[PDB]
Amino acid sequence: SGIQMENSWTISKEYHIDEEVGFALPNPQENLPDFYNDWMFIAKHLPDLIESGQLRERVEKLNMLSIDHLTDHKSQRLARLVLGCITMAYVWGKGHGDVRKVLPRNIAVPYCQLSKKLELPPILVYADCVLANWKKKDPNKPLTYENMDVLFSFRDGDCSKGFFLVSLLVEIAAASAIKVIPTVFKAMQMQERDTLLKALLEIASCLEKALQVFHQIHDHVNPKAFFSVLRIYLSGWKGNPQLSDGLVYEGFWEDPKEFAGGSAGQSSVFQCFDVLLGIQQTAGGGHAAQFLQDMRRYMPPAHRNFLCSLESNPSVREFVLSKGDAGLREAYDACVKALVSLRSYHLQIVTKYILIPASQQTDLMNFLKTVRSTTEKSLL
Numbered sequence: 001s002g003i004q005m006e007n008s009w010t011i012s013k014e015y016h017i018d019e020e021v022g023f024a025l026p027n028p029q030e031n032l033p034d035f036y037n038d039w040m041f042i043a044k045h046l047p048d049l050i051e052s053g054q055l056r057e058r059v060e061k062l063n064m065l066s067i068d069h070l071t072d073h074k075s076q077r078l079a080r081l082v083l084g085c086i087t088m089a090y091v092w093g094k095g096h097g098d099v100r101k102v103l104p105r106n107i108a109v110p111y112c113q114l115s116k117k118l119e120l121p122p123i124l125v126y127a128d129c130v131l132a133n134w135k136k137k138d139p140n141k142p143l144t145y146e147n148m149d150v151l152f153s154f155r156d157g158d159c160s161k162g163f164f165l166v167s168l169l170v171e172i173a174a175a176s177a178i179k180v181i182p183t184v185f186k187a188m189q190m191q192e193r194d195t196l197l198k199a200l201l202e203i204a205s206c207l208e209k210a211l212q213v214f215h216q217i218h219d220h221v222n223p224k225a226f227f228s229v230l231r232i233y234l235s236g237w238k239g240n241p242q243l244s245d246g247l248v249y250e251g252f253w254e255d256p257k258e259f260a261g262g263s264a265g266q267s268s269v270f271q272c273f274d275v276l277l278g279i280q281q282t283a284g285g286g287h288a289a290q291f292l293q294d295m296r297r298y299m300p301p302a303h304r305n306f307l308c309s310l311e312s313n314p315s316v317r318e319f320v321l322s323k324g325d326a327g328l329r330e331a332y333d334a335c336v337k338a339l340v341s342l343r344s345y346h347l348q349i350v351t352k353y354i355l356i357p358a359s360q361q362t363d364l365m366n367f368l369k370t371v372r373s374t375t376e377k378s379l380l
Ligand SMILES: C#Cc1ccc(NC(=O)OC[C@]23CN(S(=O)(=O)c4ccc(C(C)(C)C)cc4C)C[C@H]2C[C@H]2C[C@@H]3C2(C)C)cc1
Pocket: 124, 125, 126, 129, 130, 166, 167, 170, 171, 214, 231, 234, 261, 262, 263, 264, 265, 266, 267, 269, 270, 346, 349, 350, 353, 354
């Protein structure tokens, strides 16, 4: 068993996986210390600052603020979200091609220093704009769309609330499956047929719920706003012809540096359950594996370590198939089916929210088709 345990029931806190919200950051910080009010003002007013053409001049007038007053993980994660949103807005502007190739030192230096501390690249990633970018409206009500808000958006009407929160709610739905993983491995060591079966049925049930949460994206995200507006600010400078050499982080590196924009490969949920169920993805060969491994380096390092530990545990699939046990096989199959359905839905969302709007003004469609078929081929 690779997974380090905090006690007999819970995985080690060193993996930064919360029992209630999973890979998401629990109860995120909403305010920085007063010392950083100037950064908070800009991130909170990004929509009207971009729209009025005021954003860049405001960032250029900022004083240099040291990150030493960011003493705990939560305030460092908030600061990274604040500075990442400001960076995306500074670089892309209004999204018409008037790009900035130099990030000013009063942002670049604290952002790069903070990113070094957190071992995350100096660009907005999933762990910022989804996993840390949320609050409850009422502390005493549950985690539902109606009771939640994001902390930051880029433009009014960009649907970032719907896109980020629905994604967050899928992560939270998966958390109820992630917290069962130690029980799976314990039942395997102990030969507890029923415990393993109930654990797998629980996982499958939570993955099914996650897909029902995913369905909500159509109700909160307009495809034209997403494609023509939000995607601009999730774009990066790796292989981007508008920033062919990357971005200059003034006062941190002399040469421009390339970092990739957002990708679905930054969520740990898919790989977590592919590993658990022994599904090896092959679609797209080395170039796709290289890209996906690169996106794993854009997850929090503790979540990378969790995924690596999972790969070093005994195999659920090998255990199950050897039992002549219809019940274990059916429960395993229910998990695989729920993962196949999630991949299938992911493909249809890419189609409606990227491939189709793009057509109006191929390797991706065939990658997502192959990942779904590899998964379905893992049905025992
Ligand atoms: C910075 C940053 C940044 C901002 C957002 C993301 N989003 C992301 O990784 O979401 C993971 C998803 C997959 N989508 S998605 O709608 O197919 C989706 C997700 C991302 C995009 C991009 C524009 C970033 C390419 C496009 C689409 C269509 C939502 C979410 C729900 C289910 C399927 C997995 C999930 C299991 C949790 C990543 C980086």
